[PDB]
Amino acid sequence: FAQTGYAPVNWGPGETNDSTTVEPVLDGPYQPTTFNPPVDYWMLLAPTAAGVVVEGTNNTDRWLATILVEPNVTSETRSYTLFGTQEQITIANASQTQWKFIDVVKTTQNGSYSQYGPLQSTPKLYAVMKHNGKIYTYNGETPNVTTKYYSTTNYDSVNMTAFCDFYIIPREEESTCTEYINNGLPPIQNTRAQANEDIVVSKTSLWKEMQYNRDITIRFKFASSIVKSGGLGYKWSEISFKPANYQYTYTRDGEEVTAHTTCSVNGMNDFNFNGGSLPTDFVISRYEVIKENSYVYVDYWDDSQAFRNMVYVRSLAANLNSVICTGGDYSFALPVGQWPVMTGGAVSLHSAGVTLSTQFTDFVSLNSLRFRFRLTVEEPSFSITRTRVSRLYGLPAANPNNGKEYYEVAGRFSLISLVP
Amino acid sequence: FAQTGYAPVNWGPGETNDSTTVEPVLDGPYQPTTFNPPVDYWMLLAPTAAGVVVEGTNNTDRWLATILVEPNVTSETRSYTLFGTQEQITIANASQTQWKFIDVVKTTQNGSYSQYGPLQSTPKLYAVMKHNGKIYTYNGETPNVTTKYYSTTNYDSVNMTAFCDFYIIPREEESTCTEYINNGLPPIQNTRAQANEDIVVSKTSLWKEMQYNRDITIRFKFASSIVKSGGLGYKWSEISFKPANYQYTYTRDGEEVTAHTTCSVNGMNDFNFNGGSLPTDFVISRYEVIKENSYVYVDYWDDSQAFRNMVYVRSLAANLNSVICTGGDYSFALPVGQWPVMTGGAVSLHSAGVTLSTQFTDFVSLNSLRFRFRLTVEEPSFSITRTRVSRLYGLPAANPNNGKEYYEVAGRFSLISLVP
Numbered sequence: 001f002a003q004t005g006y007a008p009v010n011w012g013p014g015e016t017n018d019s020t021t022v023e024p025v026l027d028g029p030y031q032p033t034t035f036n037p038p039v040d041y042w043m044l045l046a047p048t049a050a051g052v053v054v055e056g057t058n059n060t061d062r063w064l065a066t067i068l069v070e071p072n073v074t075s076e077t078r079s080y081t082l083f084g085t086q087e088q089i090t091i092a093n094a095s096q097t098q099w100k101f102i103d104v105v106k107t108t109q110n111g112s113y114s115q116y117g118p119l120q121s122t123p124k125l126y127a128v129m130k131h132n133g134k135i136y137t138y139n140g141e142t143p144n145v146t147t148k149y150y151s152t153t154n155y156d157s158v159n160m161t162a163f164c165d166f167y168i169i170p171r172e173e174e175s176t177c178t179e180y181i182n183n184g185l186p187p188i189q190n191t192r193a194q195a196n197e198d199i200v201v202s203k204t205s206l207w208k209e210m211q212y213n214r215d216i217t218i219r220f221k222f223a224s225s226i227v228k229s230g231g232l233g234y235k236w237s238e239i240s241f242k243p244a245n246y247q248y249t250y251t252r253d254g255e256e257v258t259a260h261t262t263c264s265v266n267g268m269n270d271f272n273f274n275g276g277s278l279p280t281d282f283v284i285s286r287y288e289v290i291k292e293n294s295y296v297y298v299d300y301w302d303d304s305q306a307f308r309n310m311v312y313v314r315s316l317a318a319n320l321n322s323v324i325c326t327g328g329d330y331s332f333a334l335p336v337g338q339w340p341v342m343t344g345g346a347v348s349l350h351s352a353g354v355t356l357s358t359q360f361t362d363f364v365s366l367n368s369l370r371f372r373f374r375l376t377v378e379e380p381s382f383s384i385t386r387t388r389v390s391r392l393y394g395l396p397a398a399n400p401n402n403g404k405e406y407y408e409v410a411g412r413f414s415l416i417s418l419v420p
Numbered sequence: 421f422a423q424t425g426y427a428p429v430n431w432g433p434g435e436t437n438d439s440t441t442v443e444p445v446l447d448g449p450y451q452p453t454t455f456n457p458p459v460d461y462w463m464l465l466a467p468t469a470a471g472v473v474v475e476g477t478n479n480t481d482r483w484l485a486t487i488l489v490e491p492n493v494t495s496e497t498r499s500y501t502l503f504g505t506q507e508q509i510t511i512a513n514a515s516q517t518q519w520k521f522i523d524v525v526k527t528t529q530n531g532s533y534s535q536y537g538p539l540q541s542t543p544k545l546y547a548v549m550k551h552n553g554k555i556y557t558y559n560g561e562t563p564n565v566t567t568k569y570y571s572t573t574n575y576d577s578v579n580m581t582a583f584c585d586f587y588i589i590p591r592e593e594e595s596t597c598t599e600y601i602n603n604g605l606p607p608i609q610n611t612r613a614q615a616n617e618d619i620v621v622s623k624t625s626l627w628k629e630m631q632y633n634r635d636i637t638i639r640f641k642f643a644s645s646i647v648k649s650g651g652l653g654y655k656w657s658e659i660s661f662k663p664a665n666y667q668y669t670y671t672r673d674g675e676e677v678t679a680h681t682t683c684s685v686n687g688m689n690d691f692n693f694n695g696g697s698l699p700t701d702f703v704i705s706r707y708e709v710i711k712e713n714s715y716v717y718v719d720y721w722d723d724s725q726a727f728r729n730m731v732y733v734r735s736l737a738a739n740l741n742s743v744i745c746t747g748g749d750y751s752f753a754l755p756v757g758q759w760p761v762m763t764g765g766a767v768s769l770h771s772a773g774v775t776l777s778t779q780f781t782d783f784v785s786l787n788s789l790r791f792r793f794r795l796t797v798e799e800p801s802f803s804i805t806r807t808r809v810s811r812l813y814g815l816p817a818a819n820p821n822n823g824k825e826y827y828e829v830a831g832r833f834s835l836i837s838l839v840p
Binding site for chain 2: 004006007015017018019020021025026028029030165185186187188189191194196200202203204205206207208209210213214215267268269270271274275277278281285286312313315317353356357358359361363365372383386387388389418
């Protein structure tokens with residue numbers, strides 16, 4: 001005969017759920033509303049029509065307002081609804097095509113105004129920030145636009161109320177601010193050999209059918225990915241599950257066996273909390289929780305001779321006990337205010353069979369054993385404090401570990417295989 | 421020599437990526453902004469402070485407003501801003517514990533004012549709507565609230581601009597509206613045997629190893645799952661890929677064979693364009709596109725002679741010709757305005773090996789031959805009309821098929837397997 005054997009087989013992870021999130025090209029068109037944006041963050045207004053665009057009033061020692069003026073405007077009086085009052089501002093703008101952003105400042109409730117700047121811009125995009133005791137605002141002309149700094153005590157006290165669709169940018173992206181104010185945000189795009197052959201690679205081999213009954217104590221721990229959306233920080237872009245690797249050792253029958261485990265999830269439900277459009281409001285764009293319509297895969301492999309004998313497998317059964325994976329307490333660190341906390345969430349795992357995947361490369365065959373556990377919802381229910389989203393059943397991705405360093409399920413597994 | 425063969429083996433879909441997006445408990449807190457909701461849509465308001473809360477003006481012959489008054493307010497006059505004008509509006513109240521919603525009406529720009537209503541309620545919640553030349557409003561008492569209708573003309577011309585955060589609800593869920601007036605939106609929660617055994621099941625068997633070379637012409641088509649968020653209909657909650665099944669037949673070497681295929685994706689990138697928080701803005705909560713860092717799986721199985729002998733497989737090598745999948749034209753059906761259309765995007769597939777996944781249960785085992793294709797982006801790009809987001813590389817999930825009945829890749833596959 002011929003002494004054919006298994007193919008050289010290496011055990012490890014397998015194909016897994018993987019979702020990559022890409023931040024939006026801009027922080028997003030936010031609404032015209034009153035608030036006090038945090039320091040070291042730029043506000044970028046994009047008004048559509050002339051007139052008042054942005055107002056800043058710390059109500060103690062500084063009142064400022066930017067006004068947009070159409071080209072071909074000489075000295076003329078106009079009533080502008082500035083700070084809630086229809087005040088008379090006289091404007092001048094000799095521009096033929098450019099628009100003109102003009103700053104108007106008064107130092108006291110009873111004080112007068114004054115024209116500053118100006119900013120000759122075609123895209124109609126203004127940009128401001130508060131930083132280290134001053135206010136930095138774009139000014140000048142394209143393509144060599146620059147910035148100017150206006151002194152003011154209690155600079156952080158200034159609120160920024162806008163009256164047109166606007167955006168919020170970090171300071172660290174000041175290059176993007178410069179290229180946005182040279183030319184506005186990306187344009188609206190204004191779109192309109194053959195036959196069959198069989199060859200014997202080895203003559204008649206010799207194989208026997210074995211059945212290995214061995215105790216498996218599979219331990220697995222979850223891992224969570226927490227991607228915070230660029231901006232103020234009150235909104236989290238993604239709170240998702242990520243494949244989690246783990247390695248441990250346990251003794252069975254007097255033999256030390258080293259095992260590796262990889263926990264992943266499938267069929268997870270995407271809950272999304274929408275706490276408001278204000279940049280200061282708490283929002284969760286997408287966070288994943290596992291329910292009855294979800295499975296948890298546990299890719300397991302060790303160094304026991306059974307696994308070396310597991311290449312050609314006929315049947316596999318896994319009598320495994322159930323575990324109650326609970327949800328921990330994760331605190332969302334907002335820039336200000338009380339930190340919301342996600343708490344609770346438990347789910348029972350039950351052995352919904354086992355899979356054996358084999359990916360072939362060259363002539364090696366990477367194998368992977370996958371215990372897939374189906375899920376049952378059970379107490380305690382999860383909920384996030386200071387919010388109306390409560391009494392939902394599942395295990396959110398905030399803290400699937402729940403402090404526990406590993407969830408363990410033990411049992412027996414029977415492997416009817418073919419060996420030499 | 422005992423005659424041993426494969427266990428009863430069946431093929432089918434492989435374990436495929438899955439997801440489930442659950443709509444939020446409510447349409448979400450939509451900021452206070454001026455807008456004109458379409459017909460048959462309830463507007464719900466939960467003001468934080470007394471005074472003017474919501475105003476609805478058709479600008480021709482109907483003007484309505486709601487005022488929230490604290491308990492224990494005599495027949496007193498206070499200055500309120502209606503349609504931009506300050507006015508000494510008179511209001512009366514006798515409630516001790518509740519808050520009073522008072523409706524105020526007029527029928528001209530200069531016209532006189534009148535009182536209608538009222539609604540003495542604890543939750544500080546009001547609900548309004550327009551329909552078929554009528555203004556529906558929730559009124560009466562809790563937990564036994566009733567509905568009332570106001571006559572008018574040009575009911576479609578009335579706007580509804582709210583100075584406090586407001587929700588929008590579909591008509592069909594008026595039941596949930598009614599209880600939403602019984603009690604406020606869901607509470608904020610104001611929170612604080614052993615051993616080892618091996619046994620031979622069959623005596624020594626007899627096997628050989630065979631290399632089967634066969635033409636494979638795999639035809640797979642994508643499928644797109646489109647979930648539109650509830651409400652007016654100007655936002656889409658999800659544009660994802662779905663496991664796409666297909667069946668066909670083809671002839672090789674004079675033998676006909678039927679085949680089944682199941683396409684899916686992994687590593688997909690989630691782009692989330694945001695057109696603004698206004699209920700009438702075009703918003704894509706999440707749409708999936710495949711890029712350099714994504715793979716596309718194709719689970720294939722037929723009835724040929726080969727796949728009978730693929731249970732115990734020792735090696736698999738696939739040589740396939742690459743294919744280009746273009747991006748089709750998908751149209752968003754907004755109620756009004758101009759339909760944005762997503763189009764473009766070309767992705768080239770390359771066979772990065774094959775996999776054989778077998779899973780076991782109390783029934784016949786399920787096998788699946790998963791051809792995994794890696795991706796390379798190439799022109800033309802993809803973009804959505806009437807939107808800044810443009811000239812991005814990948815294949816959007818809107819219309820991956822591009823109208824073709826199937827994407828076909830044909831080539832050879834060599835299978836070194838074990839047989840009796």
